[PDB]
Every structure is written in C-alpha cells, then in structure tokens.
Symmetry: D2
Subunit: 280 residues, 4 copies
C-alpha cells in the first residue's frame, strides 16, 4: 500500500486508558492548566483511573465546567482552584487549598502556558515578559511552593512538565516560548538531581502537534497526535511503574523532530525512478 | 533520607500493560537469553506475544526459551545468531518469518563491552565491540527492514543503549562510540522509514541489578537511591513497543534513576554540604 | 613526567591577543556587565584590537572606572552607560545612547548575570525571579531592542551570549541560573534561525570555572581557564573570520563537562596495578 | 534586499587569521589530507609553519598535493599511503610519521566515505564500508598515536571533522550518520580519559561547503535553508580548525562546534517554515 495507508495501519491511535482500572486510587494529582486541551485530557485520564484531581488556572468559569464535566463522567472528584501561576501569593494560597481539600499531591503536572506566534521584532518587551512569567516563573513558583511543603511533610511526588520539541532546538516565531520552555527543562533536570533525596522525581514530555494543517507532511507517523495518547504517556510517567524514571525528557511527536532536523530528510519526496538516476 | 527514597521510589515489578494485550504479536529480541533481554522476553511472552530470541550460545538460548515458555504457556523460539555476520542474520530473519511471522516488535539488545583504559585495547578488541553493537544492530535492522518493506508491513523498533552513549565516557570507549552510532541510526530511520510504518525508539539504561562497596558507592550517585530492576525496564520497553505508543518515534528515554542528571550537573557535588554549613555560607 | 606536569606542559595558557593588531578597527561593541570579570576581559581585548566599546551595568562607579582604565591602557575610547537590563525603559534609553555616541553595534555581548549558590528550598520566589529577570529577560530586552534598531537601519551584527556548562545539563544548587541560562541558549538558536535574513548571527560560549583544588580534580586540562583565553574565543566568534558561524554553542571548560558527565569517569583514580587486577577478574 | 544584507554582513574572510609562523616547530598529521577539506587544512597549517604529514589511499593524488603545497609554502609536506581501516597499515603509518617528522602536536581525523541512498538499497558490505572508514579508521588512528604519545610522554590536540547530521541523525546517509556520531562520542570519551596525558579532543560539525546538481538549482535550494545565505568556504573551515589545534585553544577540550551558516538551527526549529509568511500575512494573523 501507499505511505498514507502504511502510516494509518501501523501508527493507528489507541485512545483508551492503558494503566489498570483504579491504579491511581488514593493518589492526589495537581494539574496547572487542567481546564483545557492537554491539561483537561490528562485530568480526565487520571480522574478516571481513580486519582483525586485538583486543577488550577485563571478562568474559574472554564475551570468549574471542566471539573464538573469530568467528575460526573468518572465518579471521582475534581476540584477547581483559581490561580495565576505567575503570582507567588495566589500560588501559595492555591497549594494551601490543594492540601486542605485533597492533601499533599503525589502527582504534579506543570502544564499552564502562554504562546504567541509572531515575528520576534513585532514583540514588545511586555509581550516577551508575559510568556516568561507564565511558563518559567509560573512553573518555578508552583514547584518551589509544593516542593517546600513536601519536604516539611516528608512526602515525595512525581513531577511532570509539558514542554515542546522546540524547547531543545529553539525556533524562530515562538522565541519567548522557546526560551521559557528550555528553562523549564533545565529546572526539571536540576531538581531531578537536587531533590531525589526528598522523594521527588522530575520528567518532561516534549509534544509535537496534537489534534485539539499540512505539518503532517513533516510527521513520519503521518498524522497529528491525540490528547488521549499524550495522557497515557503522562499517566505512565506519573505512575509507580515509573518510579525509577527521573530526569528523563521524552519526545511525543510522531517523529517530527528527527524528520525536520535531519539534513538530507528533504530528499524524502525523491521517487524510486529518480533514485535510480542519482545512483548512476 | 534513605527511608524517603525507599518509600517514594519503590519498585513496581508486575506487568503494567493489560493482560493478553500482545496476543497475535511477534517480537524478535537479540540477546534475548540473558539479563535485560530475558526480562523483556518474559514480559512480552506473559502478555501473549510470540517471541523469538537470538544470540550466539544455543544452550542458554534454548534453556531460557523453554523456561519462559513453561511459565507463560506461549511459545518462545530460540535461534542461533551472531549479529555481526550478515549471512547468519539473513538466515535468522528468514527462520523468524517462517516459524512466527514478520515481526511487529524488534528489540536490538545484543551487546559486548570492555571496561578498560583505552590504551590497553588492541585494534581487534575495539573492532569487536563496534561489530557487535553497531554493525550488528545495523545488519539486523537492514534485513528486517527490507523484508518488512517487501511484505508491506510495519513494526516498532527498540534499541537498548546506555546513558554514556549520549555523553561519551572514558574506559568504555568502543562501547560508547558504537552505542552512540546506534542512537544516530534510530533517529535516522525514524525519519526515513516512517513512510513504511516503522518507528524507532531508544532506552538509555543506568545500572540495573543484573566486598559490595562499589555497588554501595554507585547508589550514592543515584537520586532514586537504588539500582533499577529488570522488570521495571521491561515495562518501559513493552510500553514503547505497544500500540499505546504508536505516535512515539525517534524518542530517547533515560531509565537511570536520575543518575545522568546528577553526575552531569556542575554543582551537584554540593549535595554533600550540610545544613549547618549552608547557614555559614549564606552569611558569606 | 606525572599527570600534573603533562597537563602543565601540553595545556599551557597563551594569554596574549590572537587576532591581528587593529583587526576590530571600525567596529563597535556593546558589552553588558562589561565593567567586571569576564565582561571586562572581553572589553579589554576588543578595545586593544581597535573596537569602539560601550559597556553597561547598574553601578556607574565601577563602570566609569573600568572604562577609563581600559581607555588609557589601549588608547581607544570605552563609553560607560548605566543600565539595569531587567528594566526595558532603561534598555531603550541605553540602546539609543549607544547609537548616538558610538553608532549601531557590530558586536553585541550579553554577559550581565546574577547567581546564588543555594539549596533550592531556601529560595524565595523573589530570589528566583531576580535571576530570571537579569539573565533571561535582560538578555531578551537588550536583544529585542538592538535587533529592532538594526532591522530599521538595515544593518547586521554578531551576537554572543556567555552562558555556562550547566545551562545544557541543569544543576542543583544553581537552579534559577541554570533555567535562565538554558533560556538564553534557546533564544540564541531561535534568533540565529529567524534573523539571518537581517544579517544577525548568534552564538554561545559555555564556560567552566575561570580564574578550588577540589575543582581542578574534575578538569581534564588540570587548571582553571583564564579570562584572556576566554576573551580570545569570544573575539574570534565576534569577528569576520567567523562570519559563517551561527547557532553554535562552544564549551570552554577544559573538558570538565565531558569528565563529570561520563558514567565511568569515576574510574580515573584507578592505578595501573588495580587495572591489572580488574582485567584478570574479567 | 535579503541577499544584499547577507552578502554584506556574512562576507567570507578567506585569509589566514592566526599570526604568521605561529605553527613553526609543530607537526600535524592529517587523514584525507590530499583532497577537499583535508587539503585546505593542510595548506593553512603548512603556511603558518607546521610540518605536515598527510595520509590516505591514493599515493598519486597524495604526493601531488604534498608537492603542490610544499612549493607554495616552502614548508615540507610528507605523504604516506594508508588505508585507515587497516590496523597494520595504520601502525606502519604512525611509525613512519614519527621517523620522518616527529610525534605529532596536531592530529586531524578527516578521512571519510559516504553514500547518499535509501537505506533499503544498501548491502551489509556497503554499510560496513562506511563504518570501517569513518569510525574504525578514526579509532585505529587515535589508538595508535595515543599509545605512542603516552609512551613518549607527549601530548597533542586532536580534531575530528564530522557533520551536522552526526548529532541529529538523518535519513539517506544512515551509515555515515551512525559512524560520525560514534566519532563524536569517542572524542568526548577521550577528552575525559586522556586529558591526564596532555591530549585534548574537539569536533567540528560542518554544513555544506563549496567543495548530482547539473542545473545548479539544488545548490540554490540548499542556500534557502541557510540563515547566512551562502555555503561555507574551505579557508574559513581551515581557520576554525587551526584555532582549535592552536595553543590559543589549550583549554578547549570536549567541544563540538557547528560550522554551518546556521543551517542546523534553521531546519531543526519547528516553526521556522513560517519564514515564508509575508509582512501582509502577519498583519492578518496578529489581527485575530
Ligand atoms: N496542543 C498542542 O498541539 C501542543 C503542542 C506543543 C506543546 N504544547 C504544550 O502543552 C501544554 C498545553 O497546552 P494546550 O494546547 O492544552 O492549551 P493552551 O492553548 O496552551 O492553554 C494554556 C492553558 O494554561 C492556562 N494558563 C494560561 N495562563 C495561565 C496563568 N497565568 N496561570 C495559570 N494558568 C494559566 C490556561 O487556562 P486559563 O486561561 O484558565 O488561565 C490554559 O488552560 C502547553 O504547555 C503547551 O506549551 C501543546
Ligand atoms: N546491565 C546493566 O547495568 C546495563 C546498563 C546500561 C546498559 N545496558 C545495556 O543493556 C543490554 C543488555 O545487557 P545485559 O546486562 O542484559 O547483559 P549483557 O552481558 O550485556 O548481555 C549480552 C547479550 O548479548 C548477546 N551477544 C553478545 N554478542 C553477541 C553477538 N555477537 N551476536 C548475538 N548476540 C550477542 C549475549 O548472548 P550470547 O552470549 O549467547 O551471544 C547476551 O545475551 C546491553 O545492550 C547493554 O549495553 C545494561
Ligand atoms: N566567572 C566564572 O568562573 C564563570 C563561570 C561560569 C559562567 N560564567 C558566566 O560568565 C559571565 C561573566 O560573569 P563574571 O564572572 O564576570 O561576573 P558575574 O558576577 O557573573 O556578573 C555580574 C556582572 O553583571 C552585571 N549585572 C548584574 N546585574 C545586572 C543588571 N541587573 N543589569 C545590568 N548589569 C548587571 C554586574 O555589574 P553591576 O553590578 O554594575 O550591575 C557585573 O558586571 C556571566 O554571564 C556568568 O554567567 C562565568
Ligand atoms: N565538504 C562538505 O560539504 C562537508 C560537509 C559535511 C562534512 N564533511 C566532512 O569533512 C571531511 C572532509 O570531506 P571532503 O569533502 O574534503 O571529502 P570526502 O569525500 O568526505 O573525504 C574523502 C577523503 O578521505 C580519504 N579516504 C577515503 N577512504 C579512505 C581510507 N579508507 N583510508 C584513508 N583515507 C581515505 C580520501 O583520500 P583517498 O581517496 O586517497 O583514500 C579523501 O582524501 C569528511 O570527514 C566529511 O565527512 C564535509
């Protein structure tokens, strides 16, 4: 069969829960940006596997609707907490409330982000600072405060940051996002080293484009990723099956980064007949 | 301090994937008779995969194949193969297709290593490691790949390298070079062979439990406070070779308890500094 | 001869200017943090090679002194401008003065930084934010503003960011710095790609420890680096000899990163006779 | 325009950068020294006073190049015939190098082979050929010189020329990508292991250098993938190589330097394809 058909047959999405039913029972999970997109998918999966989930972002309206929607789907409680992660006080309140309504988290997912697609010369200083504040400082603030509380309580936890494939390579047009996300990965590798002694491990997923265009022509797997596939990976990394995975950075991108970064991968449209000619 | 690590990084050694979830799947595992390869074969077999294992020593291979087979009730086939010989590799792939079918899962795990000052290695010793690790994975991949293209079938490929493949390391230089070559190949074929339904990933393991003071010292370099287990490694490998990971391609996953981030961080040696010392140094 | 002597003989520092005399004549360089340490070293060399340098940091006192000190040493004028790089208004005023007194820069060195060595638990959100602000946002604010000006003027420039070896790997105890520095490296690689069309190139040096005994044992070259050595590498990367070097990250660390990062490098104190024993056992 | 800015601001400086005679008294051993990049590097080092020894398979081209450079610089270049994949030839070659010139201060591993081909069309032997020349050849040369240098209590600066795809991998050049990646891991390993012997090891990863494309349109399309807007030159590469092999770089060890006009960062960046978007198009995307 042709490319598209091989890709569809051999890279078909498996969009159901992977981990055993109720495997996350008795675990508390905290997800920033848990009300939409990737955060929402991860919450849905964790809740449905029995985790007690707490989600936090700026828009209380969307947050409550999502918490209520997942709650009635899974039977398990999702708590919503309004929080701007770039404000240390709201963060401190948020963690205080987190611990009151659920208890110390076993799973912390740093997923809240902001992004502008723009030529960099059209960005104001404030536009840049906004992305940096939400992504990097926001993740630092949440990690610092939860980290401090866990040390005091002598409990550990699994941390996961969702970054991006361009965090490692950089990219034009998404520059403050690229910088801030790169900062997030270094933080994770840093705290994986520093905080092992406290029972805290830190890992990263770098996603490519998830269905939530013909960037597909740049994806060896021949489709966009799905939220449910990403969530399975996240759940695995935040589970006890992955208790020895620490400091890891995992690409979830259908092969996109290796494709675009490989110098001669622009020969991929060259036909059989054209190859016969080149070899002569 | 070691109680927090023991409680919070406790190994979970049972099968993580759903029972019988690899039914109808065929897995080919080089170096399948021992260590990490055995543990991976065991897990895949217990989840219903039909496994084929291949390496040089037939007696160990047969014993392992028989021992797993009676534990799981699913058949494991042994094939004698020196992966550095293209003819033997050809016969092996052919036999694999004959007795089990085209593989859905390919695991390149066969390896050799010397721990030695590089200046003590002969050219032959160097070339041996390169042949087994790099050319062998290549030969296996090339041949399975050609058959899969012919048959219009795809597969998930997995190579076990090491944390020093990315960084290099003194004393394991030929291994470091060959394993790095293995990683570049996976990334290369993830891009080239996606169009054929083949995806390619890599696990970089740290020290796995395979006077006892060296072991104790090794742990001091590990944030998770213990060595890894074979069963944990196999859960990760089975995950990567499962349809749950059908959009995972070109990935490199450290399985090391945090060891690489610890040793590679410039100021991580400051972990030995005590709280009372920190109080003094913060005043300065 | 022993290890120490081999290292001494074969890795000896050459602390003199490498590039041809007056090869930076007609070039203007802007160096943040150029009043102390590595910044001062780099200014001294670029000035001594004929560049018109402009240095910028918070403390006018030290900045004015350094500028006069280098100027009298080299004969070429070094302008000081007071600037907190985390304050975008000051950055805007600073770049405007740079262009007024010297001209559009040909060389831009982002070197201003701050750091705390501390357990991460002991950091306040403010302490964290301060490092992030100086290092990442400061470098961004300076680059944004100068870049905008160079695009408007249709001129290009070579940019250089001084980071560190732990920016790529992370490190405990220096976590806000590691994060901000990694951010700076991603920025450089991003703008190397985006701004090539405008004649701007972006490179990075990752230094190890520059002029304790504990490190020297982790440095294959067996000594700390010198400021003059680092300055030669920086000068090369900001020169027309490196006009095709863009998006590069160069470790300047005596081999330290490869040493500490390599799993079996802890075996480096094993003696010949122990190696005899180890081999026999296998 | 864009071509005017790039031409003006990324203009090649193709003359020697290091001080005249700065390599007098030094000996340099270069594999593949007779052609292309190796030749260019040999020429510069000779011109700065180094005694060069070049080695590869074809004695005819090698001897010609050696003579041609010697006459241009007045400094002797020795040719030695050697297949780097043959450990016995390598041993004889190093022994000759030491007898005719001395223990090398500079070692440049530049000999290579490559196929551009769908991986499916490669025989085992074709794959093995690339691995043997690039990885094993570099190892054999390094192993033998290293052993001699240790025995003599001398050190040296080692340099390997790889490629931008050694770190990323790449379809269509898979044996070469793998072997070159092995070469990089080797440099990093020996930077750590052999520092104690006074040996340092660095790498340059070149992008496309001005020495399949009969019309000239593939080259033109390659340039569109390069921020600097041109291909690199041999003389520029040679300048970077000489810097890394000079005493000015005596504290540079385990480093990997891209020399690529920004190509690798351009192609690796997910959203860099947005460089095609015009000012007017951006005016609408930002207005939403
Ligand atoms: N979707 C993809 O194809 C893709 C690809 C690559 C990477 N990613 C990464 O994956 C993550 C998820 O992104 P997404 O696509 O699901 O949604 P998104 O468009 O990135 O939305 C960001 C989320 O973060 C929250 N947020 C924004 N500012 C906040 C703040 N100051 N404080 C607290 N929360 C804040 C938002 O909720 P509120 O508005 O209520 O504050 C929202 O839920 C991001 O980190 C992104 O970088 C996604
Ligand atoms: N164990 C660890 O702490 C650890 C840590 C990091 C990475 N790793 C990696 O994990 C993998 C598994 O190693 P292990 O610890 O299970 O034990 P091992 O001693 O590395 O196992 C070697 C395996 O490779 C096979 N083999 C060797 N030469 C072969 C050849 N030429 N052709 C075919 N097969 C060959 C052996 O079988 P035969 O003898 O029958 O040929 C044996 O099964 C290796 O790739 C290793 O590099 C292990
Ligand atoms: N020194 C080493 O062994 C080594 C090792 C690794 C990395 N590095 C890196 O190399 C670079 C050189 O640092 P260094 O060691 O020379 O001194 P440093 O302490 O790292 O840098 C301080 C410099 O930055 C300026 N600065 C601080 N905050 C500023 C702000 N808010 N706005 C403007 N300027 C500011 C300071 O001047 P004012 O006080 O007047 O503001 C001073 O000149 C740094 O980027 C550092 O990260 C150095
Ligand atoms: N030019 C570029 O655009 C570019 C780009 C990326 C990387 N590179 C790298 O830069 C280096 C130089 O490449 P190049 O373009 O000058 O030519 P090349 O085709 O890459 O290298 C051929 C050279 O290697 C020698 N050689 C081949 N097999 C040998 C063997 N078995 N033993 C000893 N020598 C052998 C050849 O001499 P004999 O025929 O006499 O044996 C010739 O001098 C290579 O390592 C290449 O990988 C170049």
């Amino acid at each position: 069969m042709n490319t598209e058909a091989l890709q569809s047959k051999f890279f078909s999405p498996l969009q159901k829960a992977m981990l055993p039913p109720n495997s996350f029972q008795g675990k508390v999970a905290f997800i920033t940006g848990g009300g939409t997109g990737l955060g929402k998918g991860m919450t849905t999966l964790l809740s449905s596997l029995g985790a007690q989930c707490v989600i936090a972002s700026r828009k209380m309206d969307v947050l409550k609707a999502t918490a209520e929607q997942i709650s009635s789907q899974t039977g398990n409680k999702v708590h919503a907490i309004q929080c701007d992660v770039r404000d240390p006080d709201m963060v401190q309140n948020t963690v205080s409330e987190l611990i009151k309504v659920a208890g110390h988290p076993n799973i912390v997912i740093n997923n809240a982000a902001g992004n502008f697609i723009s030529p960099t010369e059209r960005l104001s200083p404030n536009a840049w600072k906004t992305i940096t504040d939400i992504v990097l400082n926001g993740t630092a603030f949440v990690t610092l405060e939860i980290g401090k509380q866990l040390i005091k309580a002598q409990k550990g936890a699994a941390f996961l940051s969702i970054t991006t494939i361009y965090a490692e390579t950089g990219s034009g047009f998404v520059v403050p996002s690229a910088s801030a996300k790169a900062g997030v990965e270094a933080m994770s590798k840093s705290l994986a080293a520093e905080w092992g002694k406290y029972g805290m491990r830190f890992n990263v997923i770098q996603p490519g484009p998830i269905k939530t265009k013909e960037m597909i022509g740049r994806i060896p797997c021949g489709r966009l990723g799905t939220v449910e596939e990403l969530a399975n990976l996240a759940a695995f990394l935040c589970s006890d099956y992955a208790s020895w995975i620490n400091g890891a950075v995992i690409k979830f991108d259908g092969g996109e980064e290796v494709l675009i970064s490989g110098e001669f991968n622009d020969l991929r449209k060259v036909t059989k007949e054209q190859w016969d000619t080149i070899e002569e």
